[PDB]
Design a protein around this ligand. Structure first.
Ligand SMILES: Nc1nc2c(ncn2[C@@H]2O[C@H](COP(=O)(O)OP(=O)(O)OP(=O)(O)O)[C@@H](O)[C@H]2O)c(=O)[nH]1
Lengths: 85, 105, 847, 167
């Protein structure tokens, strides 16, 4: 709120190996531009590099419940069978 | 336009299968009468009828349409080993939240 | 005729001789929601009529997005006409005049400018998405303009190759889309002959990317061509709905033989298509040659080496062929210019169909009086001179012939806006290249040169020294209202004339652009949204004026209204001080301003029907209900004027001598409004005692009109004035996970969610919400950024709602550069708009 | 003025000298009435002087108008860069004792009716900077004491002539 008003007012009125952390962008006041919503990719796509189990633990759990709701008992038991495999 | 490619999870499911991620279709015609004298001749059948609908590599070969290049290819020209960045699509992604400032810079 | 042109399947002499037979011409517009596949419909069609023009393997040449901003922006921004000779199922050839319209909700004025000169519509409906915001809006607009509607359910590979639905559930999805379209059509139209069904040939199934296009009859003709003995027209009548094939008796029943039996569409049309696509994309090395042998398709070895997407396109091209289902659908269900010339004159000609020229035009006779109607103006790449584009409704326009261009204000007594000009050249316009011709008969579309000077938006082009009583065609009525507003000024004020000329040129380009010069010497542009005004400013800077132009912050247009009846009856006397009028102002009943604006009622009605309406619909006594004098600042503006003067109190006959002046004063004072010079909406003005001076030299003229305006202002001001915000209607399509982020983004901009609901057969959701137009700049960017691109919204003007505060309250303290709380938004919006218009600092509330 | 020098396209706002050293809200604000009043005043004053004896060129003047649109009065006097801003006008704020600010007060009623923020003319800063450049550049073989003596002379001159304007 204070930083928002300051933003409006501003708008309208040696060998260094490491990068200086003052060169960084991304320090916003808008909470929509700091706490972005993370893509879930239908709960079946993941990110490159990172450990798969970590992502599977840290995902938003929306689609797990949406399966548990929509999935019928036959599809539920088939999914459980693959899970146990 | 958003791609709605429903990624497959079981190899033991039909390739064409109404996934639970897909919102259900809530069910609910100048047709002629059955007594109308239209007969389909003896040697007439749907076009590919002995051909099975899906094969054991139809689910996998559709997933290859939505693959990143070079995996959405099936032929091409070789590159040099040094001309292939393996992490150039890693840092073209959004700057990850929660990493220390050194990583984001 | 003598112009170098790309090689065509047909020959330009056949095209020139098809234009003289108005039963072989089809004037069609292509429309739909954004990105629903219209461009390559025509593009894939230009390929089949242009052997050397071939789409690049990895990139689609849109061939109709000819401009620059279209090319990198990847949106359709302008309508582009295409003229092609297209063969039918039975090999017959027709001349198709196709108009490719954009599908962004901002650019709908191009759609209306293409609907005017068309006899039918082809609505494109993505098979995965379904029926979206612009699909419904264009359906409403096209059944209103009295056009014959067909439907192309495009992008049906997404059902196979993305959603991977079982063929039967793909059938359910297509049937659901057709049913939604039918429901909308019946919503917006009383008569039932616009029933859409693939059994009537009304609906076509397509996938432009892969060169698929069929109706039921063309697929049945594929069968008939292979197995020669079936009558494909009676086959086609059994290929949709709950009709099943009984293979033992070789007959089609209405009841499924036993169980697990497939409907005829699935069994005979959808399973073959699933199997072609699956064989190509999955088993290309293993068992594709065997099935291509079965279908009778032989690909050379250098072609089976193609990537999977070019291979699929080529295989489907070989199997299906040309787009003769499209031509069948349009030839059967879209009228020829000759047959559709009667609704066209009935609807869009100011002279009425019963006039003599409204009879010579309704025959579409190419030897009659010239009557050409242009709705678009296309700019030569140099950006200097334009070329009008319309259709010849009668007669025949020749190159070199002198014509009489009539403007939009021309009437049969005020003949000053007409102007003689000299047609220079006439081009038949395929999308990219123009084919110069020497004449264009009735029923065709022509690009005219030489008449570009005296027309701003639209025109009626006739013959001089004849056609002495030729009126105009009504100006385009648009889907929306232009609400967003920016002001411009050159950086160096020495070159203002250059920017003024550029503003005139953009006014010609965009059909619904409205550039005006406010009182303060400020030049204002009205637009529909951010993409629209972004492209308008792009053009203004880079095409028509090559100077640097400053842009003000975007704002909206407001409107002024009341919320009770004026406390003390107000009054105003003339400077003569013998004529006295007395009014009070009260708000219109709920839901009447829309009826007045949406021509549900007109004052052209006789007093009997007008009074009967008002009586039965809003509880008015016959006295007042027949007492209505005028309607809003326009002929249809959302305000009424009622005379409650009793015949005993005031001589009704004598009062009638100032009715014609009180009406004008009320119209002008509602056009301006006292608060911030915005329109007045939803206000009822009752006169109470109009003491009239008997002396005609004392009343009438410049004495009574300003008195009427001033009493209008005072009466409006004694009923509690309010401001009004344009409210936008936002539809968002986002995955189920990103639905809550939509709520988070909306709530910060005074947004209020009406509904969220899944998309049948699709993994996505549609959030519909209302947001103030002013609280909307960057809302699309906020939503597409917070969601990492996974949520997308098109927003469109819906209604006018009251700003929370009270505009006339000096107790409110406003700082210069910070957002207000809602309790006093109205006060800020009022005073800042006053400051921007150049008026005083605050109102003078008085009598 | 406009009778003698009409402006059809409102071009009087291009050759207007401003005091670029103050913030944008503390400079002159170039509204049309105020720009025209400044130009009119300058043209009136210039016409009085015969052009043969001496002239006042526009490019070397600065005409600052205080009106309902401009709440600050600005001028450049004897090397100082002053900006008067009345208390009843756009201040709306309690002020502590700032070094550079002069608390002007009415001589009859002893009430703070204004302030006068002070600065150093860009010309004066550049002149001092050039003096120090002469110090360093002309050194060569001089002793260190002479160099520091010249530096102290320059610093004392500047900082005893511009006492609060430096701060
Ligand atoms: N999956 C699929 N994509 C298609 C098909 N046809 C077109 N597309 C793609 O969908 C997008 C639609 O672009 P256009 O066809 O140019 O869009 P439009 O319908 O003209 O609409 P505007 O952008 O408003 O002009 C492009 O990416 C096309 O390549 C189809 O049959 N299937």
């Amino acid at each position: 709120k204070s930083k928002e008003l300051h933003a409006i007012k501003e708008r309208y009125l040696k060998f260094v190996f490491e990068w200086d952390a003052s060169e960084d962008t991304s320090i916003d006041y808008n909470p929509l531009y700091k706490e972005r919503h993370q893509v879930q990719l239908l709960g079946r796509g993941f990110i490159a590099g990172i450990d798969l189990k970590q992502q599977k633990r840290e995902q938003s759990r929306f689609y797990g419940d949406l399966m548990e709701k929509r999935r019928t008992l036959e599809e539920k038991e088939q999914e459980e069978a693959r899970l146990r495999k | 336009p958003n791609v709605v490619f429903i990624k497959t999870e079981d190899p033991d499911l039909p390739a064409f299968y109404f996934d639970p991620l897909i919102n259900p279709i809530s069910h609910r015609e100048p047709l002629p009468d059955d007594d109308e004298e239209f007969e389909l001749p003896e040697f007439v059948e749907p076009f590919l009828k002995d051909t099975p609908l899906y094969t054991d590599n139809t689910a996998n070969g559709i997933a290859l349409l939505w693959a990143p290049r070079p995996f959405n290819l099936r032929s091409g020209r070789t590159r040099r080993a040094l001309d292939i960045p393996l992490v150039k699509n890693w840092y073209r992604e959004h700057c990850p939240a929660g990493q220390p400032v050194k990583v984001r810079v | 005729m003598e112009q170098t042109l790309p090689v065509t399947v047909y020959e330009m002499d056949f095209l020139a001789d098809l234009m003289d037979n108005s039963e072989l011409i089809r004037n069609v517009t292509l429309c739909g929601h954004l990105h629903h596949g219209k461009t390559c419909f025509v593009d894939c069609l230009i390929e089949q009529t242009h052997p050397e023009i071939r789409k690049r393997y990895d990139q689609d040449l849109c061939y109709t997005d000819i401009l620059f901003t279209e090319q990198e922006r990847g949106v359709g921004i302008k309508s582009t006409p295409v003229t092609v000779v297209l063969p039918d199922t039975k090999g017959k050839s027709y001349l198709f005049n196709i108009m490719d319209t954009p599908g962004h909700v901002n650019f709908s004025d191009e759609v209306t400018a293409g609907l005017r000169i068309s006899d039918g519509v082809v609505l494109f409906i993505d098979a995965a998405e379904g029926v979206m915001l612009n699909t419904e809006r264009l359906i409403k607009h096209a059944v209103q303009e009295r056009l014959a509607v067909t439907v192309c359910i495009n992008k049906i590979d997404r059902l196979i190759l993305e959603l991977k639905l079982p063929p039967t559930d793909a059938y359910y999805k297509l049937r659901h889309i057709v049913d939604e379209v039918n429901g909308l059509i019946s919503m917006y139209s009383t008569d039932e002959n616009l029933i859409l069904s693939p059994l009537l040939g009304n609906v076509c199934f397509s996938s432009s990317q892969y060169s698929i296009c069929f109706t039921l009859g063309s697929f049945a003709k594929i069968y008939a061509d292979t197995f020669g003995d079936i009558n494909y027209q009676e086959f086609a009548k059994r290929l949709w709905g709950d009709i099943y094939f009984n293979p033992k008796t070789r007959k089609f029943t209405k009841k499924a033989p036993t169980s697990s039996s497939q409907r005829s569409f699935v069994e005979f049309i959808l399973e073959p298509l699933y199997k072609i696509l699956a064989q190509v994309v999955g088993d290309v090395d293993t068992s594709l040659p065997r099935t291509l042998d079965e279908l009778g398709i032989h690909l050379t070895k250098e072609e089976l080496k193609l990537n999977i997407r070019p291979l699929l396109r080529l295989v489907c091209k070989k199997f299906f062929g040309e787009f003769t289902g499209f031509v069948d659908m349009c030839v059967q269900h879209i009228p020829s210019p000759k047959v559709g010339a009667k609704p066209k004159i009935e609807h869009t000609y100011t002279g009425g169909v019963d006039s003599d020229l409204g009879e010579a035009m309704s025959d579409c006779d190419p030897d009659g009086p010239l009557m050409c109607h242009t709705t678009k103006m296309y700019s030569t790449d140099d950006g200097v001179q334009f070329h009008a584009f319309g259709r010849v409704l009668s007669g025949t326009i020749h190159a070199g012939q002198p014509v009489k261009v009539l403007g939009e204000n021309y009437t049969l007594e005020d003949e000053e806006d007409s102007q003689i000009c000299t047609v220079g050249r006439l081009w038949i316009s395929v999308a990219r290249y123009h084919i110069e011709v020497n004449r264009v008969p009735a029923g065709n579309w022509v690009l005219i040169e030489g008449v570009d000077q005296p027309i701003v938006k639209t025109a009626t082009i006739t013959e001089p020294r004849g056609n002495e009583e030729a009126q105009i065609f009504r100006p385009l009525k648009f889907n929306t209202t232009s609400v967003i507003k920016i002001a411009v000024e050159p950086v160096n004020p020495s070159e203002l004339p250059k920017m003024l000329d550029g503003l005139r040129k953009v006014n010609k380009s965009y059909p619904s652009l409205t550039t005006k010069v406010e009182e303060s010497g400020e030049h204002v542009i009205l637009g529909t949204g951010e993409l629209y005004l972004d492209c308008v400013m792009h053009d203004l800077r880079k095409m028509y004026s090559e100077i640097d132009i400053k842009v003000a912050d975007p704002v909206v247009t407001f409107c002024e209204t009341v919320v009770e009846t004026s406390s003390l009856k107000c009054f105003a006397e003339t400077p003569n001080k013998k004529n006295k009028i007395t009014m009070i102002a009260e708000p219109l009943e709920k839901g009447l301003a829309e009826d007045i604006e949406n021509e549900v009622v007109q004052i052209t009605w006789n007093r009997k029907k007008l009074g009967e309406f008002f009586q039965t619909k809003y509880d008015w006594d016959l006295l007042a209900a027949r007492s209505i004098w005028a309607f809003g600042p326009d002929a249809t503006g959302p305000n009424i004027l009622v005379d409650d003067t009793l015949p005993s109190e005031v001589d009704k006959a004598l009062l009638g001598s100032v009715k014609d002046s009180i009406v004008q004063g009320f119209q002008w004072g509602t056009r301006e409004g006292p608060l911030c010079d915005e329109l007045i909406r939803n206000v009822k003005f009752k006169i109470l005692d109009a003491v009239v001076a008997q002396e005609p030299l004392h009343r009438g003229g410049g004495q009574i009109i300003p008195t009427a305006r001033r009493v209008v202002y005072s009466a409006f001001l004694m009923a509690t004035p309010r401001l009004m915000e344009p409210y936008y209607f936002v539809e968002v399509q986002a995955p189920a996970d990103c639905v809550s982020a939509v709520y988070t983004v909306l709530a910060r901009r005074r947004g209020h969610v009406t509904q969220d609901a899944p998309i049948p057969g699709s993994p996505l959701y549609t959030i519909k919400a209302f947001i103030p137009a002013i609280d909307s700049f960057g809302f699309e960017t906020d939503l597409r950024t917070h969601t990492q691109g996974q949520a997308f919204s098109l927003s469109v003007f819906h209604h006018w709602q009251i700003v929370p505060g009270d505009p006339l309250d000096k107790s409110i303290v406003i700082r210069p550069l910070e957002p207000q709380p809602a309790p006093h938004l109205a006060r800020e919006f009022m005073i800042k708009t006053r400051r921007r218009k150049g008026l005083s600092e605050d109102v003078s509330i008085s009598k | 003025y406009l009778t003698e020098h009409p402006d059809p396209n409102n071009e009087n706002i291009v050759g207007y000298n401003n005091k670029k050293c103050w913030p944008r809200d503390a400079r002159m604000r170039l509204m049309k009435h105020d720009v025209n009043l400044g130009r009119a005043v300058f043209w009136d004053i210039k016409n009085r002087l015969p052009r043969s004896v001496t002239t006042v060129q526009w490019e070397n003047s600065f005409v600052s108008v205080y009106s309902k649109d401009n709440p600050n009065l600005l001028f450049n006097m004897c090397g100082f860069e002053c900006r008067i801003l009345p208390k009843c006008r756009t201040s709306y704020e309690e002020f502590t004792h700032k070094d550079g600010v002069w608390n002007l007060q009415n001589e009859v009623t002893k009430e703070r009716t204004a302030q006068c923020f002070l600065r150093v003319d860009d010309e004066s800063m550049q002149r001092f900077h050039n003096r120090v450049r002469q110090i360093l550049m002309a050194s060569g073989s001089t002793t260190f004491t002479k160099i520091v003596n010249k530096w102290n002379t320059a610093l004392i001159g500047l900082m005893t002539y511009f006492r609060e304007a430096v701060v």
